[PDB]
C-alpha cells in the first residue's frame, strides 16, 4: 500500500537523526559513547576541537566525522540510550534500500534534523525535480526528536 502512507508508532526505530538545541548548536559533543555501546560496531566517530569564533557544539569538542554503516546497524537504539546529550535519536524513515554497499554508510549531514527523507529518497528527488514523499505518518513526534519535521496529522 505504497499509495497510502504507513502509520508507525511514536517510538519506532528508524534512520538515526542528530539533533540540535534551540541555540542552533549541534547537541553532539563528539564523545564516541554511542559507538562504544554498539553491538555491531556500526559507528565510527572522529572528534575535533571547536572554534570559539565559529562553534558547532557547546563543549570544547564536537564530532568532525560521524558515520553509521546502515547495513551493520541492527537498530537497537542502544546508541540513543548511551548518548549523554540526546544528540543521536532514532528517526522514522525506513525507506532506505539502496544500490552500492558503501552508499549506505550515512554521514553527518545525512542525519541532522534539518534533513528530509533518506539517502536514496533524496538522491532520486534530486535528478527528478519532484519533492520527497515520505511513506509514513505518526500520531506525534517524540519529545526526544525535538525539531524533526515529519507527517504527523494522525
Amino acid at each position: 500500500y505504497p499509495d497510502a502512507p504507513v502509520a508507525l508508532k511514536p517510538r519506532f526505530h528508524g534512520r538515526h537523526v542528530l539533533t540540535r538545541h534551540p541555540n542552533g548548536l549541534e547537541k553532539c559533543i563528539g564523545c564516541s559513547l554511542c559507538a562504544a555501546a554498539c553491538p555491531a560496531y556500526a559507528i565510527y566517530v572522529e572528534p575535533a576541537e571547536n572554534d570559539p569564533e565559529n562553534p558547532v557544539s557547546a563543549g570544547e569538542r564536537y564530532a568532525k566525522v560521524y558515520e553509521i554503516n546502515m547495513l551493520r546497524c541492527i537498530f537497537c537504539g542502544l546508541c540513543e540510550e548511551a548518548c549523554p546529550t540526546g544528540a543521536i535519536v532514532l528517526g522514522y524513515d525506513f525507506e532506505m534500500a539502496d544500490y552500492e554497499y558503501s552508499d549506505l554508510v550515512y554521514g553527518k549531514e545525512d542525519m541532522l534534523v534539518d534533513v528530509v527523507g533518506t539517502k536514496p529518497q533524496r538522491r532520486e528527488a534530486k535528478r527528478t525535480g519532484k519533492p520527497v514523499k515520505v511513506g509514513y505518518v505518526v500520531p506525534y513526534v517524540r519529545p526526544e526528536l525535538e525539531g524533526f519535521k515529519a507527517p504527523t496529522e494522525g
Partner: protein
Amino acid sequence: EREGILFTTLEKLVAWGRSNSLWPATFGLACCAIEMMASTDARQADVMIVAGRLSKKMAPVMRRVWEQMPDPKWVISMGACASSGGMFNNYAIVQNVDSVVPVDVYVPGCPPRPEALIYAVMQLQKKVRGQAYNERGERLPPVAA
C-alpha cells in the same frame, strides 16, 4: 548498431517490460523469513530475495538455487545478516551475501519493516529500467553480471 536509437529504444522497452514481469522468488532464513511473509500475504522465477542469516553451511546451497535460475535475474538482500555481516561478525556467518551471489539492492533494517521490503523491490524495479544511479552519480547496469 548496438548504440543506435533503434536498438536502444527496443532494449528500453524490453527492460521496462520485465520491469513488471518481476517474479519474487523468496529465499528466507531466520527472523527475516517471517517479516517477508507479511508482504507476500498483503497481495519460473527471477529475482530471489535473500532474507536472513546466511550460514556458511547454507551458502553453497543458496548458490545452486541462484545458478539454476533464468538469465534475466536479480538479487535483493534483506536486512543486516544478508546485506552486511549483520551483528554476527563471526565464523558462523557470511559477511555479505555478495560473497556468493551478486546483489542488486540491499535493504537495511532488522528485520526491515514489511513496507520497506516493498520500497526495496521498487528500487530493484526502477533499476532494471536502467533508471537508477548511485551517490557518485553513475548510471547502474540493470543486471548483476
